[PDB]
Amino acid sequence: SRIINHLRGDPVYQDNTKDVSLRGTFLRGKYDDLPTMIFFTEACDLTANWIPFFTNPQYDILAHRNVWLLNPRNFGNSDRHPSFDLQEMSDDVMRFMYSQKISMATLGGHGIGGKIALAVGCYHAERVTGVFSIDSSPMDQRYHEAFKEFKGYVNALTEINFKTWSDKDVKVFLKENIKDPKWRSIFTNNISKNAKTQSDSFNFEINYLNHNLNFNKADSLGNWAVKNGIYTGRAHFIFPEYSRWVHLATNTLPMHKVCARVKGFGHDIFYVQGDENPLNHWVYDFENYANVVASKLNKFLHSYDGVHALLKDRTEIGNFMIPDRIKSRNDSKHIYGDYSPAHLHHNWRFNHIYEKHDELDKKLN
Amino acid sequence: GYKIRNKSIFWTRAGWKNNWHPKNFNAPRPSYGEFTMGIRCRNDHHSFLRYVQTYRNMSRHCKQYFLGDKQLEETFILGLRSLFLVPYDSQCLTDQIKHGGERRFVDQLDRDFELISYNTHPYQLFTYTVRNEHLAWKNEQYEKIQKGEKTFEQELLDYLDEQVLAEKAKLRDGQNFSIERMTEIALHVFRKARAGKVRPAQDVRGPDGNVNDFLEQRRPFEHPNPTGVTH
């Protein structure tokens, strides 16, 4: 109704990668003015599944930020384009932020969504306050068994022809071809019947996706290219102790390799205590995994996100002074010294809060 | 995938994508008869006929070693033309080259014929090797056909013709057997067939991220000392 507001539109196939618009659900915050959070769901996974996580009073995430549960291109209701280049998919978010009048946002993701979120910070860092990645790492996962299954299931889904196949023929196909219960449920709910019951189809572009995965080259979503570069801002990673996607042994090094400010395990990288279960990837289902993710998320949003690099926490804003490099300012008659860096309002561009407060300041004097 | 982002990639001081007349200080300038006493120049108008005679020699001197293979002479002719049509179809404005592209290409082709006259040009040796590898495979087929045996190429052609009948015998709702379907049927057969062969490892990485070389033997250690020859 009010808290839950998802803009409605129809996907449009686009020949130009720049004329791509993203659509998703918006969750309003409890308080009037709060920074915004943009969260990308796992590939081929529903945004609705994350609503109870972001709308739980026990966690109270909306008390911190407004949440945009956004679908990437070729997924859900967003526009469709065969390319999955993270630079192109990142520019899509920048246009969404512009059309929605968002100066800068907090980015989050689950699994492959985490890659997409981190890519935006790599290509557009001046407008991203932080990244919160869940069970993902900036790494080539093409040869992880978990990815192969997802890559394999998507290929099986290309065999079904909705025009000829009946509803029962589909259900039998999924149970036999898809063993994982969650993926099976995810794919079923992605099936939709267009207006006038012309035919049933998947909400995500099955053709464009399978080519990306089946080709299994650099542009694949499992791959993380050196072209994506480095993320300069705040980044926090949370993944299960026993996770098929992120192995604690070596899959943590890519974080240091790609994220410059990542301190390491126990500060910006955590693992949730859990058992071996292939379903642990879906933390929002299990309360034990979710409670830890939420607490770490609220801590990142409250104290670490949108904080200058050389500052420890938000507590140091206004009391910790950063050293200055010599000959860094235009003024020649400037006595170089330590300074507290400027932290701006989250939507200072599309509002006039600075112009307004300047007037109020004059009235004092 | 990846595109060059620099918009000025093809810019030169002479213009966009100019590889025919680069800008240099000592530029060409005209000459006037009434004021010119003497001149030393090597340019002439003999390149057209030298371009013709060069083609005839390169063709006739390479055919000496084809042993009357008509199919090779015709294939070589198509390849020889591709080498002489470079200035006629290139993006480079070969007509605007600095000091005469006609003389330049002719002199460049002459250096190729010099090697052809000695039968030392790499295209010649590449041709002999490629052809011998081809005839050995055609003779292997001939020996199998004279014996009444079936070739590996026919076993697939016959195995593919039946697979098509099986697909269109069940494809009754529709009746458009596209070329795409015909293709992925053969590829499914080629991958299965190629994997069956004991071929050297071509891809760096196998199903796992690990490399498929003889050097990718890590711990744990489970191999004993090497054993000697048996008598």
Binding site: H247, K257 | D208, R218
Partner: peptide, 29 residues
């Protein structure tokens, strides 16, 4: 990061394994 460790342990930070096997061979091909 630019602070990866000691010079002796430098060839350690390169390996990235696709499986959960321990211990992990360090050498990156």
């Amino acid at each position: 990061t630019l602070q990866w460790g000691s010079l002796a342990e430098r060839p350690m930070v390169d390996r990235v394994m696709s499986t959960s096997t321990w211990p992990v061979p360090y050498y990156q091909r």
